[PDB]
Symmetry: C3
Subunit: 356 residues, 3 copies
């Protein structure tokens, strides 16, 4: 009976699964896109507009004749936002004061505006990159991450309050038999969440000849999963009660990737299938002489990409891919913003040069 499923035989599998289950109902921060540079650029646009002729200001759709000019079409919303911001009480005075241009002669206003031309041209692509980053990463949010991870763990597309429910944990609820419920990657794939995987790898079936405590001796299996997982919820509660795992905060792509890699290194191939958990014979039925496992039906080395298409695996992968991008773009945005704030400071100094 060492070859049967005994207490602790799935203990090490359980540790990896526990780490994954701790991704449920997650409250993480995400890497911050530093968008302070956008305000700095807007401030420069407001200075430029303030220093413009009464004819140019009168303009604030581009007007007939420029409706089709590619520069006017791109700049219009930017100019419109600047004009609107400038209308606010004391805002133009403040803009001019910061620039050293309060009560400036017209000669100086014009020279100062012209001086801004290269500065604005240098800042434009920096600002446009920052605005692109912002847009590209706008779905990397704590909420979106939490929902995707709750789909992975519990099959529930919600930010919080996710709980074990077989209707969600197994795709279309539990099958007619445990053997069929504990299959994934196959034509009738059922064990499509981390929680279903835990049930398959750890449950105590009713009726005797069970593998109670396969996932650890500290589980208090107070009930059982019924026959054919009919009442898996009570048993899952007892199993998951033993899990204390917490992921690092903020959550990183690297951590998620390491967790998926850890699972992949535990799956074992036999007879044309892959298995997570102890498999002896027949199938993943919850019987001690058979197996307490997930059967990745027809999974093989050359078809391992199919593991990554299983819903929980795909959801976690999507989150990691989003975080991988956002981590880099956040670091880039720090510098873009600092540079734009520096351009704003430069624009505020040009009058000093020109007076002198």
């Amino acid at each position: 009976a060492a070859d049967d499923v005994n207490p602790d035989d799935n203990k090490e599998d359980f540790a990896v699964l526990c780490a994954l289950a701790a991704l449920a109902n997650l409250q993480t921060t995400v890497p911050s896109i530093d968008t302070s540079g956008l305000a700095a650029y807007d401030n420069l646009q407001q200075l430029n507009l303030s220093l413009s002729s009464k004819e140019w200001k009168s303009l604030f759709q581009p007007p007939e004749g420029f409706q089709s000019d590619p520069t006017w079409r791109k700049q219009w919303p930017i100019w419109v936002t600047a004009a609107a911001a400038l209308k606010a009480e004391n805002k133009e005075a403040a803009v001019l004061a910061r620039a050293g241009l309060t009560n400036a002669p017209e000669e100086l206003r014009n020279r100062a505006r012209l001086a801004l031309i290269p500065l604005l041209a240098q800042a434009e692509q920096i600002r446009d990159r920052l605005s692109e980053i912002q847009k590209q990463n706008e779905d990397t949010t704590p909420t979106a991450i939490a929902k995707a991870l709750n789909k992975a763990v519990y099959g529930q597309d919600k930010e919080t309050g996710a709980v074990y429910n077989s209707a969600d944990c197994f795709s279309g609820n539990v099958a007619d038999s445990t053997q069929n419920s504990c299959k994934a990657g196959n034509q009738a794939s059922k064990a499509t969440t981390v929680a279903a995987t835990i049930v398959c790898v750890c449950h105590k079936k009713n009726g005797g000849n069970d593998a109670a405590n396969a996932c650890g001796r500290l589980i208090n299996h107070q009930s059982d999963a019924g026959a054919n997982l009919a009442t898996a919820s009570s048993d899952f509660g007892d199993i998951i009660a033993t899990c204390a795992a917490r992921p690092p905060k903020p959550l990183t792509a690297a951590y998620l990737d390491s967790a998926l890699a850890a699972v992949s290194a535990r799956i074992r191939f036999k007879n044309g299938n892959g298995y997570l958990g102890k498999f002896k014979a027949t199938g993943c039925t919850g019987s001690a002489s058979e197996g307490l496992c997930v059967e990745y039906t027809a999974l093989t080395a050359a078809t391992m990409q199919n593991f990554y298409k299983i819903p929980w695996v795909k959801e976690i992968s999507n989150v990691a891919e989003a975080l991988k991008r956002t981590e880099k773009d956040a670091a880039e945005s720090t510098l873009l913003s600092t540079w734009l704030k520096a351009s704003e400071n430069q624009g505020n100094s040009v009058a000093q040069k020109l007076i002198k």
Copy 2:
């Protein structure tokens, strides 16, 4: 007796603990804040000062009348450092030569100085950010990290030479009983270091009915831990002798976070407490029929934050948080410095434009 504590029953716990114990007496490099930009900025300040009027130079506390001017108050130490540096033999000549301003006419000196105004204004916030980074990360040092990690592993706040000593490894030395010494997170928390955790999870008690080799069959337990851990040091020596772990270098936040996450995923909850190591009944006493473990008294899922307040856990967390910041700030500083060096090169070119 499979449910008793047998040889190897804590082997996998030991591997994770070994990785943590290898953080003792650590000699790591830390991410470098690239401060070369500060010198570049100083060089620009020296050029600006060199090109100033004899009246401005005569000034080198701001003088009566400017003592309260916010710009003079901020710039004074910078200007003072520039003036001091310029006094050094041949330094002003070298500054002027690099700028193409040796023997420059007064007209050109003045125009060149004015040209510097926007350049200096752009560089100022870049330099101030770099100086802020430097200050914010000045305690992320190999020494500070080593001391915090030695507190974590051995309870000894020192850079090197940390060793097992029960007076330090257990908070206030060992308790009256093993059961009480092998508790953490509770009103009389004792097992507050990684080394105490290893003792609790791995020791061979005297008097028979011990769990020798729970942490691995290659341990040569040549002695024992005494009764109630009275002579734990000799036994700890034999246990730790089997540990070969090395962390990656340079040490990273990610690695530390992964190690704490790995421990968290191993702690098992039963009867209102958490346990690391095999627990059967009664307590973590070192007796084979009872347990060889740490009891995280009253630890539960909803109170898991309390695990992170345990001294060794907090120390490692602090180190990881420091490294997480410094990794990012180091990457930012690379670009800040390159930009400041480029500004210096730009300042050295303005005379060529103005001559022509």
Copy 3:
């Protein structure tokens, strides 16, 4: 016989080894050095050349008199590339059009060129840093990584098609005895690849009293490794057939470092040597009463650096060190390139200022 080598006794060692073996025949992307800034700089050089005098253009070795001028020596290839690019049909017209300098008066051409002086001087060190990064990281390629990792796993310095072959997996082929083949770090070091390590830790010897299934019960050992590993290949095939591991993509330094750290934390020291896999007595012979392991002969805590000199360990370390550098330099290059593109946009705006 719990102290003998039984089925599953090396299962956890095998999971870590499987993760390492999955580095064979790897197809990863590497962090991209963003070199778009180099083209941007070239465009600026072409604008500068276009705006130069017919005397300066006539020049396109520096000419007699400037052959030794440090500026001319550095700039010559850059200027030569610019002149060559400008000769291409319509290229000069396009350069001038982008700059607003089509049909520009000579006065404006000259003023515009002079305006470029500080811009080019600021861009020069940014471009030179980017070109340095490019050169420093030019061997961090998918091909080079794949070859080094195939040396690590299979001892075959090739990009793809690496397979088990004892002539390559063991240094100089298998030794006269398993005990001697399963040694590393010593005067006659043999087990110098991950695959040799797997053979040593997992093989089924012929002749009875073997430790079949030490690395897991799902292995179908259809044959055996012969006597003294004489036919290890067939047996290795059956063992590795059970391994499904995939590393994260793109491959990271952190992942590689974590994998080497994981192995280091598993090696156990006894009797002056280190061991990976279960060791009871005598040596790593494949006999159940002796050991199924690699013997790191004379490895000790103070000599653990010697583990990192073992060929597979060194190869993976080299890859991680290369990736660690390239990850950082890639992130730096993103900003260098954005800045150079912004300088190009600035250069294209100077005529607008000067006309006005």
